Structure formats: structure tokens, C-alpha cells
Swiss-Prot record:
GO molecular function: 2 iron, 2 sulfur cluster binding; dioxygenase activity; ferredoxin hydrogenase activity; metal ion binding
Organism: Metapseudomonas resinovorans (Pseudomonas resinovorans)
Matching PROSITE patterns: RIESKE
Its job: Part of the multicomponent carbazole 1,9a-dioxygenase (CARDO), that converts carbazole (CAR) into 2-aminobiphenyl-2,3-diol. Acts as a mediator in the electron transfer from CarAd to CarAa.
Record protein name field: Ferredoxin CarAc
Binding positions ([2Fe-2S] cluster): 45, 47, 64, 67
Cofactor binding note from Swiss-Prot or TrEMBL: Binds 1 [2Fe-2S] cluster per subunit.
The Rieske domain, residue ranges: 5-101
Field pH dependence: Optimum pH is between 7 and 7.5.
Subunit structure: Monomer. Carbazole 1,9a-dioxygenase complex consists of a terminal oxygenase component CarAa, a ferredoxin reductase component CarAd and a ferredoxin component CarAc.
Length: 113
């Protein structure tokens, strides 16, 4: 909502490509161009800690490079074994021809007694 991370020009991403987005002190994101639409998840495969931005898109499915598990990039839901834990999904907006991913940070929670 408030936090947006500038990735690159929309024209800098060919369809079927992934860009990794690093966040100082937080988990990296993967931004995917599927044809003419943009999606984002956590970059880190929930199964065995691989970088999904080093994988292969097959339409709207990201194939993990380590064990060939896979996720739907739109839903974050597992699409191939051995993946069982869904990815966090992040909103992506193109603003003035530039790709931004939501920082979906400001997750804030106090000590309960
Ligand atoms: S690390 Fe991704 S499928 Fe195992
Ligand atoms: Na495939």
C-alpha cells in the first residue's frame, strides 16, 4: 500500500523473464513478466532455499532450479512436487512505464503478556 520498490522499466523485461529484487534486511522477491502481465512472489523456494529468479517460467508457473518443484506466480500456490508450502504474493504496478513491487512490509506486532 505505502511501500513500493522500483524494479526496472517494463520494456527491460522480455515476456517469460524474472528479476530478483533485494530488500535491505528482508527476504528477496522475484518479479515475473508472463506475456504482458507482471506478478511477484518471495524469491526463496519454500522447499529447499533455491532462488526462483534462477528458474524457468512455463506460462504462469515458475519451475525451481534446485529440485524442479514449481509454483503458480499469480497465486503463489504449489504447482509441482516437492513444493507444499505456498509463496507470499506481492502486488506489482507499472507506473509511468516502470515496474514497482509492493514492499508488503510494515508488518508490525507487539510483545503479548
Ligand atoms: S529448493 Fe525448490 S523444489 Fe526444492
Ligand atoms: Na516445463
Amino acid at each position: 500500500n505505502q511501500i513500493w520498490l522500483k524494479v526496472c522499466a517494463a520494456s527491460d523485461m522480455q515476456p517469460g523473464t524474472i528479476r530478483r529484487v533485494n530488500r535491505v534486511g528482508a527476504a528477496p522477491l522475484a518479479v515475473y513478466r508472463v506475456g504482458d502481465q507482471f506478478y511477484a512472489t518471495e524469491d526463496t523456494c519454500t522447499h529447499g532455499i533455491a532462488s526462483l529468479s534462477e528458474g524457468t517460467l512455463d506460462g504462469d508457473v515458475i519451475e525451481c532450479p534446485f529440485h524442479g518443484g514449481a509454483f503458480n506466480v499469480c497465486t503463489g500456490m504449489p504447482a509441482s512436487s516437492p513444493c507444499t508450502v505456498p509463496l507470499g504474493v506481492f502486488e506489482v504496478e507499472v507506473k509511468e512505464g516502470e515496474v514497482y513491487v509492493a514492499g508488503e512490509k510494515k508488518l508490525e506486532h507487539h510483545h503479548h503478556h
